[model samples]
Target chain A: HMQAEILLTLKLQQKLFADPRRISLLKHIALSGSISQGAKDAGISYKSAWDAINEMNQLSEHILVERAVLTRYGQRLIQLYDLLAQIQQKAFDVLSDDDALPLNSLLAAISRFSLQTSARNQWFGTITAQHVDVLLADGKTRLKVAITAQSGARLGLDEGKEVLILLKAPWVGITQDEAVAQNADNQLPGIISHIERGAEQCEVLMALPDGQTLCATVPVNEATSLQQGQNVTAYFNADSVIIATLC
Target chain B: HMQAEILLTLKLQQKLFADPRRISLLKHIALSGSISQGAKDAGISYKSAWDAINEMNQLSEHILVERATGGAVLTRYGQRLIQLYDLLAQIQQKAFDVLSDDDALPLNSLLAAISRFSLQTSARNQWFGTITARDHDDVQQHVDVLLADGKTRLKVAITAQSGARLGLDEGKEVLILLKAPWVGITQDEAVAQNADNQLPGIISHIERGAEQCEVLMALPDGQTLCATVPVNEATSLQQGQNVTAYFNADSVIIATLC
Candidate 1:
């Protein structure tokens, strides 16, 4: 049992976004792309709105809000902040009582099962197509799949047939040549899309032949020569791919 | 094409918990349970360590760290903060360059959703089980899920559309999410015929608050479930008393991981 209320607040460095007033300001900006109109709606001066955005941008490695032309990625980042604010608001709803043990157990379970995998990225999507082979001796069939949808109708995904193709970043080997001699199960030839440089490692984003992209995280020293728009091949072993389907 | 290194930081009011040293301090304290030792391990003085905890405690409505018999322990709020900090650290580790590629876009979206989806709502009581049977009618479906212990059964009411969309069938694992308020606690032994989930357990702990009271029940299989009751209704409840926890089939929400 406890007297204190637990609230989850998300901050970008010293800038705080959990305040209700700031959240309202963000909602206004998200609703209307104009900063001035959003400020007016939130009953704040344009200068204050600009200050908030600037502070948030400064705290985040990636800018939180940008022009409409960059809305695609910018909006997703905003949504992340929005979701954090929601959790911060709702976290207190259940903690108003003294039984802190219940909340502790829930948090324990959350910490335990949140991410059980060592893979860098665990993406969820719907499978549009599947290539099923003859049943093998182990009573399992080899399958090739395609993920067609980005995000939508998660529950209704099985209404057709959806699958998850798990690929680890380290398992994604990249080669510059058009043809490579390898035994990787999936061979995707695409242009070098983007590179994120870190102190020890670099992430390579490859635009695959099917328009879907794959990511590879390699040592920084090996990727120092790589640049955008260069052609490369992303290959991975079949055993490395973990498939999850809605039965 | 990115210019700056992105790192995630958590703030409660004006206090910041982004410094690597401070995070390490908290981590050490969480593991060691001794503020002095944790500070020593983190290379900070005990006075500065206390100052940091006080700052964090003052920034939020609740206390993050509290003194226990041994030394110091993190409250649930502190643990949640730690989890968020870890998530932020993980997010910055992976950098994004493009969002147009179908796979990359979906993967990015899924990663974002995963972080938010894990703890969106405060459903105090949850149980993991596999569906044993399902019966569908025109509008709704009744699903029977067996608990991990194999003795308890939870019958859930789900919309026919949802059942189809979620691919609800026998042998599939699911997480049953139930809000604490909906979980009814009673001393009656006859079982609540009106409720779908009715399992008897001993009251392990009770916390009385200004407006409501909480009751935690320890089941025979060593699992704990909690229910929130009004202050007046909770007067009859006592720790170590045998009671049944009940909730309607409609009160349950089933989710599957893919």
Candidate 2:
């Protein structure tokens, strides 16, 4: 494998971070403001450049490629990615004997970083029931997710299955009714810990049963009467939930 | 600075003929027999998978790909295009390999190439300022910032870690980043309440586009702020129009050199 050809590929979670091709696409895009020319400069088809952006966009919540430009997030990614690539290769050129030097799993060890997505509400849990019961952190609370049988199979939802639940804050709302909250598919009871309000909307931070907290956004009018210590249930449609795993 | 490290990256031009990402998408479609699955496998969303294929169909002037009973299926031309792109990629890759090590650019040149990415209108509306006041606001913290000119004060939010890392303290000079995307400009001083984080100014210039427009405004004292606003919201806007710019403390990306 190292007989004059050593290509180091990295993954964020299960997704490929990038190979050189994507790197060139990024470099051309960053160098040239318009991606059309960026693609041409990179010797890739225009549509391929567009496709590369779509894949890069998944790397973070921030928009990397958009409207024919490399964003700050994209810029940062390229800067670090290029720097990391050089560091890996030249270090390889200098090494005559390795692997016993702990270089065998260097790329794998380097890729052990977590990927951060745009979704505000990300919680890790395991399926306690086959139909789909996610026992979130602290193990006391359980979330009954609502996905179709086909969707469940697609997600590979089953007992003891570990999955990350993704939900945006806008989807979650505060429900004052504790009795009505139990009837919902996804409802977690908590106390108001903090409220970050803009002019029109407000982010309601709830102190969950466990150590961690959940956050939601509601109309400022709705949050006007909410006190910091007030108790409320954060509710969202389980259908709004997105399931992802290392697999 | 001379000992700055440089990193070399692969430049195969990954995606084309919907090359790599697209080529990967097509193969995944062929393998998995579904666009949705293939989309994820190709690191794209389902909608993008649909759009990518449709664009290819349009550009090729033939349905290289089509939907069948299961999901997506490639036609004769579809498979041909995938093969064709790879052949070209290999040709380019070989040429690239020859020059790969020959380009012995200095670390500073890469650093020079890198400076624009950061120093450019990065995210847009960047200013230099000093910390005038630092308040730990319950959970998140807030730092009152006085601009380089020393009169205009802006506020930004910070985490405890940033507080410790930046060593943010009164009199410590730092950089203030305000994204044009997050800034809202309007004449409604009413909405520019405390949460408005309002800085009243007069529009210096307005560049209108089809959907969104850039608004350049001057604060009463003399600082300038640039904001990207919707065309519809700014239809009534013009040069010298009095308005207020609202930038939240949350939108601030405070920075400094170690």
Candidate 3:
């Protein structure tokens, strides 16, 4: 009876199923620029890091780790978040503005009180239990459980069932390329097909071979802001976006 | 040998990994926006639904399951992907519009070239049989193998000289994990009985973390590596050492246990 069975160990790990160590690693990778640093900080051996990451990449059904480049979808999300931040700042200017409040202020006031309107806001999302449905929401939204009802980032359900408000106001343009910083070669090869400048930021879309697409958004003055259809390799620049997209 | 081996089975779960039956229930819940409906759709006995999911919350690192609400705060990764679908679609459409070669070439052209390219790119298993693990001085640099067939996801690691002598470049043998090797589950009585220190438990105790929960592995003679699971993987995994986790076993299911 004193003998330790193999099942006991498995049972404990099985009971603890998810490792807090690995979660911190993922969080670090997200915080830091490179997956390698995340790997290193996690004390992952180089021999197995890439392979383990590859397993995850294949598992997530999306490229969670790559050479570190901004993606088209990621860029769009960044732009959208930037727009949201700008809208919030403009609202703040109104609140203490030496100016009058906007028409939406009443609604905003009600929301601030009910939702504990703190200026600081963060955004996070993860696949549903099955990794099939995507659930997106903001930090303040609390529920006793994850809604089976799809909303926001999901396909069906109520208009506002699943919503995430990204409220981090501080913004900075990525000046350095992550791949180049690591001195790693780019994976995809192609050239920029179009670079359009809107009122705020310039959008550069790269048409990569193999049907993959890469995009970047930078301030007009950023040297990497790219021109209309400039030639580029697969080097993922800081300008590279990192957001999940459905379509 | 009444042993339960380590096994990790990963599948493409369409439902979120929040609670037991989370995905199946999601189909109905997402459709009806009610726990009852979701459970009905999932075909799970409703009586056990709440209790089942509650258990998940307890075991999980933090609270991941939540009620269905339209709020935009603290959204999850997958949820955020949904929230930005409109913009993603627009950007994807924009990028697709710029695929000049794919656009100009007809479907027939792609079909026509498929065979030709494949004929030239036939599968050729050209292996790099060498016992040389690439130097990791430059963290950014990685070793790549270009076999005759083309580049594959496989990376070569010089795990042993025996594998090298056999012309098996990156072959690795994973050590199987048994309950006896674990420290967290061993009892105080077991520790006391480990006076000879020949037990696996004894070796692990000597290597306890100075500041962290550490484990020291003993070899026939003497050898050890910092035995802490990397942070990223440590939180997501429950069982299986490197060798065992990489191997196969069964009886795993998806559900967040409280």
Candidate 4:
């Protein structure tokens, strides 16, 4: 029915997070620090906004927004979306330009990368110690880490190297004692900073000595008794501590 | 006394489709072609899945998953969503497995950003080159940069502040980003006009989507650039046809290492 060199038009809506309505709702909520106000600004019912928040919270392994607190995570989403859109626009501009430019090299030079992980707590630390003997009979070098006696001893690490430790929220155990006797790879004492109770699971946010926050996901049955500001120790298995190093 | 070793505790949650519950419902529906079966797979009531489908249809710019004779089929938009989610999962896995403290936080951050960023954007063509010349307008604080890739030359308009920040000089490498919609192709052997850039090439390939098609042009140097055009315009374009591609410099985006 038609004859032309098909011009594939660029549509911004196809880009990620291009939903103006959803973004406006999030922005309002962030600006007012109130879900109700956000709903009002977006001309949506409180129930609708609440449902959306609940939905987003569950979509990410880590909750994106909290009912009572203003989090940087929410702000980061908007910023991330903007950054993506900008790059996309730039790509479009260069491709459509009259001059045929070599773009692969330019893309290669940019150093920024996106961090995606389901693990809630990501900490960068130095491998201060290691035990050289084959602890697991596999002759794997088990190293002693300063983070916890149990985890450091099992990691099979070398001293003076930097490593990233990953722990899922469910694997982190919490205790009220200053000294815990349970066998764990690590037991770090910290104050329970925050808690978000879901229908079946609860998220416990712990403030560590280094001033970084570690989040733990616990079953409702186990977390029912925990409260904020309480002195607690977070525990996990040495095997639970997944260490990653760059080659 | 803080005498106890302060080891950080972490948890790994591999629960795919952990929340919003609706995305999983849509995915299952797309897979099994039945809302009921999808609902069963999602461990939710049929009524719940139906309601979610209705809501998602309303929420998206275009309808995502839909009912078809065979069961369920994903629209283009739905397919894109799945693709994006898979990339997100890959990113999570890499973050969990690849980084160590030996790599500084800043280094990891850069890698993470790079991993998530890709050229498969709304405007799908990009090229890399280096700056060769600059003409500065000190009065307007605007600088026009000349980028060269051996056989071709392109110009870009940038703020003077940006030029200084990037330390742009002769031989500074940069990326010239563009969108498919901005490119104009012609079969006529026309003269290069007052436009920003013009390059002669042959149509190398054409891939059609539902609403549009992408035309890939192979340059003399063997690098390829593409233009996205409507299906109607595609009738005139054929594989291995000599054509000239033209684009404005204003549409070009200059990118450099941060």
Q: Which candidate number would show the highest lDDT if scored against the true structure?
A: 2
Chain A TM-score for each candidate, in the given order? 0.37, 0.55, 0.23, 0.44
How close is every model to the real structure, measured as TM-score? 0.32, 0.32, 0.19, 0.29
Write the residue-wise lDDT of candidate 4 on B1-258 in tens digits.
111111111111221221236666768877787878888998899887767666555543357776676677876666654443343333333332222111111112332244223322122454555566544433343334332235466666554655666666676655555667667777755544545678788898988877777789976555567787787767688898988887876565554554
lDDT of 2: 0.61
| Residue-wise C-alpha lDDT for candidate 4, range A40-155, written one tens digit per residue | 99998999887766655554434556765545555554543344334443332332333433333223323212222224665655454222211211223232222233334333
Please identify which of the two predictions, 1 or 4, would achieve the higher lDDT against the true structure.
1
What's the lDDT for all of these models? 0.58, 0.61, 0.31, 0.54
Q: Tell me the deviation in Å of residue A70 in model 2.
A: 24
Which ranges in model 3 have alpha carbons more than 4 Å from their true place?
A1-247, B1-20, B64-258
> Which residue pairs in candidate 1 have backbone atoms (N, alpha carbon, C) closer than 3 angstroms, thus clashing?
A1-A98, A2-A98
Q: Which candidate do you rate higher for DockQ, 2 or 3?
A: 2
Which ten residues in a row are the worst by lDDT in model 3 chain A?
A1-10
lDDT (0-100) at residue A75 of candidate 4?
A: 55
DockQ result, candidate 3: 0.02
* Cα RMSDs, all models: 27.5, 18.3, 28.3, 30.9
Each model's iRMS: 12.6, 16.6, 26.8, 20.5
Candidate 2 deviant stretches above 4 angstroms = A1-112, B1-258
For model 4, what TM-score is found for chain B? 0.47
The deviation in Å at residue A86 for candidate 3 is: 42
lDDT of 1 at B125: 55
